[PDB]
Amino acid sequence: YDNREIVMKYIHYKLSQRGYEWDAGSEVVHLTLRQAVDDFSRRYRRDFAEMSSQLHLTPFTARGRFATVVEELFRDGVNWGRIVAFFEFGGVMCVESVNREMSPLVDNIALWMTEYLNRHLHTWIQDNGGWDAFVELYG
Ligand SMILES: CC1(C)CCC(CN2CCN(c3ccc(C(=O)NS(=O)(=O)c4ccc(NCC5CCOCC5)c([N+](=O)[O-])c4)c(Oc4cnc5[nH]ccc5c4)c3)CC2)=C(c2ccc(Cl)cc2)C1
Ligand SMILES: [Cl-]
């Protein structure tokens, strides 16, 4: 499995489902993630809605805001649900970057998500069965 491909295909899906074609953006993990993320957004739509309105996103503060939320999301540890929420939050910032006329941020956000998966979540994901376990548990 490829963390970068999973991030890239999700963002392209999230932005396309908001009417935007993201330029820079096995098959079962993408399908399972997109369904799990949609399920999470449905169940926590108010949190999704209020997260966009409270971001105060500028190119100067974008990374500090991304890192602060991701830090808090995994402060108490990692599970598959928080990983799904991690993807959904990354989608918020990408849609919000496009809405606020800051589409270049999508490529930076894609990189920050890939880095976090490669360097901080990778060991937990591998030790808890990898994405194979994720698709088995929820796909
Ligand atoms: C500053 C902040 C950090 C503060 C906090 C918040 C918001 N928080 C984030 C964490 N959150 C969590 C965390 C864990 C869990 C969980 O139970 N975990 S679990 O037991 O491992 C698991 C259980 C079920 C599925 N799947 C169901 C399947 C059913 C059949 O269809 C396919 C899917 C999965 N799974 O991996 O799919 C995994 C969870 O509950 C659910 C419930 N239903 C879910 N459906 C999909 C995921 C999911 C999680 C919700 C609560 C909300 C902030 C915030 C704000 C906006 C955005 Cl945008 C983001 C974050 C900001
Ligand atoms: Cl990386």
How many domains, the chain?
A: 1
Distances (CA, A) of 88 to 14, 92, 127: 9, 6, 23
Best of 31, 32, 113, 138 for a ligand 1 pocket test (most atoms within 8 Å of beta carbon): 138
Nearest-10 crossing angle of helices 80-99, 130-138: 90
Structure tokens at 89: 């939050």
Question: Which residue type sits at 112?
Answer: W
DSSP classification of residue 17: T
Range of the domain at 75: 1-139
Residue nearest to atom 30 of ligand 1 (CA): 138
Resolution in A: 2.2
Preceding-residue numbers of gaps in the chain (C–N over 2.5 Å): 25
Which residues have CB under 8 Å from 108's CB, separation 6+?
62, 63
- PDB experimental method: X-ray
CB of 36 sitting under 6 A from ligand 1: yes
For residue 138, give the amino acid letter.
Y
Cβ 133 under 6 angstroms from ligand 1: no
Instruction: Report, in this order, helix, strand and coil percent for the chain, each rounded to 5.
Output: 75, 0, 25
